[PDB]
Design a protein around this ligand. Structure first.
Ligand SMILES: NC(=O)c1ccc[n+]([C@@H]2O[C@H](COP(=O)([O-])OP(=O)(O)OC[C@H]3O[C@@H](n4cnc5c(N)ncnc54)[C@H](OP(=O)(O)O)[C@@H]3O)[C@@H](O)[C@H]2O)c1
Ligand SMILES: O=C(O)Cc1nn(Cc2nc3cc(C(F)(F)F)ccc3s2)c(=O)c2ccccc12
Length: 314
């Protein structure tokens, strides 16, 4: 149920996502999750609910349902903090909100730096995001210092394409390799090329939006529905499991970590019940065949950033 990272630590292959979890409901969602067995929580400052996640974690530690060493807590450096001088402060705010004295993993959330300020998405008068003149290698060095200071046990990246991964790997004076690349991944966006690249470099891949993020605020009704894909439902039926459970088990069997989000206690529990069955090799290849290169997570206003990651093939 855990995978070995290149930093020597073990990461649970199933975690709870918290993007879009309302602040008034996420405390209970994370308490329920830890009660039913989750030991990995995926967080971010930009999700604006870390204080409330933190309440849950702290309460379960206080109740001795879990000890700190058994938890694997992940957070992410937001785009407006890529400057070398801001990275520590961003990490300590996340730590302060989560009521932790270290993070198990801290990720560069997106490869694109934006102008620092109070705005998460600073725009110019015509709507383009205002970039920062920070490059991912200086940002990376600043992340490495967090390891040396003991604020984080591992560092990694997210939404980096393979040329941007390669840039870090080739960084002159590279001190800690990224441990994880967290990317969008589901049967409509299977990422075989990027995943193979990352794994071949011993970088663990975490698959986000594994259910297709049907609650993403920019969803359109024309938009496909993984959960309602009758081919996926048939595979679930074959296994006496729900479609969500198949969608969660699928990345696990490609040696990925996967982080489904839910604030519904029945679904939190359901999503955890994925260790009692296995998809066949043929099931796996069939699921891979549904790839559409359909990406649910990105943003127009950022398309001219120099470091925009999805122009590349992979
Ligand atoms: N690094 C990045 O840039 C990045 C980007 C996107 C996401 N992520 C991370 O990955 C997580 C997961 O991705 P996501 O939030 O985009 O979406 P997701 O996990 O693919 O989908 C969550 C949606 O599915 C619903 N759902 C959950 N379990 C279900 C089940 N068993 N049956 C039916 N519906 C179910 C949830 O509903 P309820 O909550 O109402 O139950 C919610 O509407 C995020 O929360 C975040 O932690 C990271
Ligand atoms: O980030 C989350 O975890 C989920 C997430 N995704 N997106 C879609 C995005 N698309 C991007 C594209 C770039 C780009 F690199 F391409 F420029 C940079 C940054 C982003 S945010 C959002 O706009 C967002 C807003 C608030 C909280 C979470 C999110």
């Amino acid at each position: 149920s855990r995978i070995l990272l290149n930093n020597g630590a073990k990461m649970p292959i199933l975690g709870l996502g918290t993007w879009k979890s309302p602040p008034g409901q996420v405390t209970e969602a994370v308490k329920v999750a830890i009660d039913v067995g989750y030991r990995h929580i995926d967080c971010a400052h930009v999700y604006q609910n870390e204080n409330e996640v933190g309440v849950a974690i702290q309460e379960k530690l206080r109740e001795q349902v879990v000890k700190r060493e058994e938890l694997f807590i992940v957070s992410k450096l937001w785009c407006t903090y890529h400057e070398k001088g801001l990275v520590k402060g961003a990490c300590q705010k996340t730590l302060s909100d989560l009521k932790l004295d270290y993070l198990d993993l801290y990720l560069i959330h997106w490869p694109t730096g934006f102008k620092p300020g109070k705005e998460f998405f600073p725009l110019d008068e015509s709507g383009n995001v205002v970039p920062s003149d920070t490059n991912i290698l200086d940002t990376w060095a600043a992340m490495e210092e967090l390891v040396d200071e003991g604020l984080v046990k591992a560092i990694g990246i997210s939404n980096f394409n393979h040329l941007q991964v390669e840039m870090i790997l080739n960084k002159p004076g590279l001190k800690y390799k990224p441990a994880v690349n967290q990317i969008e991944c589901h049967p409509y966006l299977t990422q075989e090329k990027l995943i193979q690249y990352c794994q071949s470099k011993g970088i663990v891949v975490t698959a986000y939006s594994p259910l297709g993020s049907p609650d993403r605020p920019w969803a359109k009704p024309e938009d496909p529905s993984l959960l309602e894909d009758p081919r996926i439902k048939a595979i679930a039926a074959k296994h006496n499991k729900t479609t969500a459970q198949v969608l969660i088990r699928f990345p696990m069997q490609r040696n990925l970590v996967v982080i489904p989000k839910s604030v519904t206690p029945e679904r939190i529990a359901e999503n955890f019940k994925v260790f009692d069955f296995e998809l066949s090799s043929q099931d796996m290849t069939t699921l891979l065949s549904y790839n559409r290169n359909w990406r649910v997570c990105a943003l127009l206003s950022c398309t001219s950033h120099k470091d925009y990651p999805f122009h590349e093939e992979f």
